[PDB]
Design a protein around this ligand. Structure first.
Ligand code: FES
Ligand code: FES
Ligand code: FES
Ligand SMILES: [Fe+3]
Ligand SMILES: [Fe+3]
Lengths: 351, 351, 352
């Protein structure tokens, strides 16, 4: 039992912000060294961060326009990862001098990566388009690395009861979310779950922008898991009105991307519907969001991972309850999908 | 191989001092996460530091009178480790929401713990009662953690020749202990070993309280090993008299408690017979004792462990000698006891 | 890999002569073995398994007693031959079994060479790097670097010196001129040689100030030769005006490695310069600025590579080998062939 992830699907490799034109970005993804850089025309490129000569990482190399020269013996490679120049001996450039390229897709303020040996299926990139709609200082992205298996983070985000007791002022729901039985639906595309409640005051994240900050407000959490590790939490607070349409609301995306078995690249994006222009505040939010996850959620999930050791979640006979229905359905669906994928790996080997 | 310790015996889990009423003490014991806390009435309680919901440690949780709520999703548990409250959904609390409780015994200024699945046998807690007798500022406890297998520490304490060459002024025996062949007895309860000698000056630990500090003094080391890792070193210096009865003496307990294979919780307790009242000195002793073990014994035993690697002591064909008779008898008895225990486990599995 | 195999019947550099300070008890891990070294009264260096056979305490931690070592635990003493000279316990009788295994040493070229194999030593096999031992003693100097890599990655670097164009900064940079040169390489029964010649402007900083015109162009030569198990004897220098390299501001180096285990390596270097031979004030300033170049510029790439390679055997990963990789392959293969040939006549002398 060496670890198995879904291969076919689109994982978030990096925030759009993390590749600064000239910069040679490197990151480990599904246990693979990956280099990224942009070209002249902004076009992002992903390669195996590994020169095929003596296996030196390429990110350590020097950039040469839209080509990378490896820092060891200076073989250059183009964006397609064929060798453009050998400066040794006769000069002849071996057919074998190729870096494998990773199909990228730059939507929702992230670089999505296709790791599998097959051709990409841009179809499978799920539709989180509302992030791309509206004044650009409402949408913002943060990254957190955590030394845990990805499915522990998903499980946290799918069981939002935790917010009552885990989290401090910034988003605390004050014991009110826990008692609510959520409406959960399995579908062919996604797995949804909706919590509704009310508290006093409203969650600090929304309260100041409400009609009466101090006073009570109805809240809604609609989430949906999509393969391999994406969850699109929509949240907000209405006062007075029954129609949630007026709510001081928000479109979030929690996505994970495993580094290996027990490390995980955890990306978050908000897009708020309130004071949409103010980038001075947008930074102050997304910083105070990252804070909440990294400082309050981070340590519990990591603590759990340590107490769990390497042993598979269900193997430890967890005492599952009212609030664990959604996060199980996920783990099982993902499990079923992984086996189904391994099947039609050996069946696409035939066909 | 996982290593094998004796179950169905009392290991020291913590000094009585280490559990401060309100405090949620945590410690790893025989490769098990263990929480301890006191109740209103002082009563110490031991539980598997692991909420059975999602395997969050409970020590991280918030305390609620004589109950602990897990900091993740706030399931509460009583001292018996049955769940007293689920704040989610309908509210129903599964029978299955149980943390395993560890029988404790608070004698000799330690919390003794019974790790095995069976009912405790307080019979087996050996009788170190003289610690509990007398003015409370003669008795004192210290703890040292060392990154070694427990049987390496026992072996050190059973072969006290080492004090001649290992230790500095505080307790040095000046080459006089080494040449003595000790009287050793294997017994049904214990394994005893007695060194007698004389040196000049007396061991610094006793010398000032003797008739003539500078002058020679007869010394005695009576030790007895009891299962699983307890050694009850009695020591002292007489001058003039033949009868050791007058000696500036002391009742020590070396006990170990493995964290896992190659880590060990090493607890020590002195109880001196001299200037029994003076707690100002008692601290100055037990500090200068810990010093000697941690700074002089500590580094050799840890160095050895590294040089030994993972390989079983006897497997390395050690060149055993005059002074290694006691520490072998121990290792063998403990080995025999462990196998004998595993036998009647597999034979009560049949019968 | 878990069947990590080195050549046994050969001389590895255990330590720089400088690293054993008479009284001092030097310790070092060599071919996965704890090893103690110390000198005697008469300077004579001694190597032992750093491990008291009583309770397996390391001996280096012990206290020294003239030309004997007492183990710090229970004070069994041992002579330079590693037989026990004294038991201070019980009756006093010293068991035949109380022995430390001794490692044959050879103190040449400013290093302590060690013979790890169970056989008797063959001083024959210690290759001849004698020019280090010749000349004013402030031209010769030694440095040590530890790197968290398999030894054959370091050898491979030193045998493919093209890297100096792009890897290294000012102190030795060859400015893109070395790479295009196809070197003359020869396999031989003793060694594997390889010679690069070229010219650049300025000359390599290491030589330029001592040349006729520092700023002006100079012909350079790199003659190297690999000898088993991990020794490479890099000769380098710069001539101006003359065709005859005989006049060159030159140098005799030795790169040698000595594996700690699979993926750690003791890397020793010795220069011996032919210029301003007396000035020890400068000699230190050179050998420091040499160590710098290897540790700070070479070190991080070779370690980075090792990480990217993981544990997997070099050739197994299908490396894209080229004009400049001919020498470093011939080496790896020769060393490989030698190791198997050695293991063969071990299992065949086990039979007959
Ligand atoms: S490995 Fe990059 S060119 Fe040598
Ligand atoms: S994990 Fe124990 S509170 Fe849910
Ligand atoms: S272990 Fe070396 S003297 Fe006891
Ligand atoms: Fe001691
Ligand atoms: Fe180099």
């Amino acid at each position: 039992s060496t670890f198995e992830c879904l291969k076919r699907a689109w994982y978030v490799a990096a925030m759009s912000s993390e590749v600064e034109g000239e910069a040679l970005f490197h990151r480990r993804i599904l246990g693979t060294s990956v280099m990224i850089y942009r070209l002249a025309d902004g076009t992002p490129v992903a390669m195996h961060d590994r020169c095929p000569h003596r296996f030196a990482p390429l990110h350590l190399g020097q950039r040469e326009g839209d080509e990378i020269a490896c820092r060891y013996h200076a073989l250059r490679f183009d964006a397609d990862g064929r060798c453009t120049h050998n400066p040794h001996g006769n000069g002849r450039i071996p057919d074998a001098a190729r870096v494998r390229r990773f199909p990228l897709l730059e939507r929702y303020g992230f670089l999505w990566i296709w790791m599998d040996d097959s051709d990409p299926d841009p179809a499978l990139l799920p539709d989180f388009s509302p992030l791309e709609e509206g004044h650009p200082n409402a949408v913002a992205q943060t990254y957190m690395h955590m030394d845990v298996n990805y499915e522990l983070i998903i499980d946290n985000v799918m069981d939002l009861s935790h917010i009552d007791h885990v989290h401090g002022e910034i988003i605390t729901t004050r014991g009110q979310l826990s008692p609510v039985v959520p409406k959960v639906r399995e579908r062919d595309t996604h797995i949804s779950a909706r919590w509704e409640w009310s508290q006093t005051p409203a969650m600090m994240i929304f309260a100041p922008f409400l009609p009466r900050p101090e006073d009570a407000a109805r809240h809604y959490f609609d989430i949906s898991w999509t393969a391999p590790a994406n969850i699109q939490l929509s949240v907000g607070a209405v006062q007075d009105s029954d129609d949630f349409g007026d709510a001081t609301s928000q479109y979030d995306l929690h996505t994970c991307t495993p580094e290996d078995a027990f490390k995980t690249h955890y990306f978050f994006a908000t897009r708020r519907n309130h004071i949409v222009d103010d980038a001075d505040y947008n930074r102050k939010k997304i910083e105070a969001m990252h804070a909440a996850f990294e400082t309050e959620d981070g340590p519990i999930i990591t603590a759990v991972q340590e107490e769990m050791g390497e042993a598979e979640f269900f193997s430890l006979d967890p005492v599952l309850m009212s609030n664990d229905v959604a996060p199980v359905k996920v783990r099982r669906r993902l499990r079923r999908m992984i086996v189904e994928e391994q099947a039609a790996a050996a069946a696409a080997d035939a066909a």
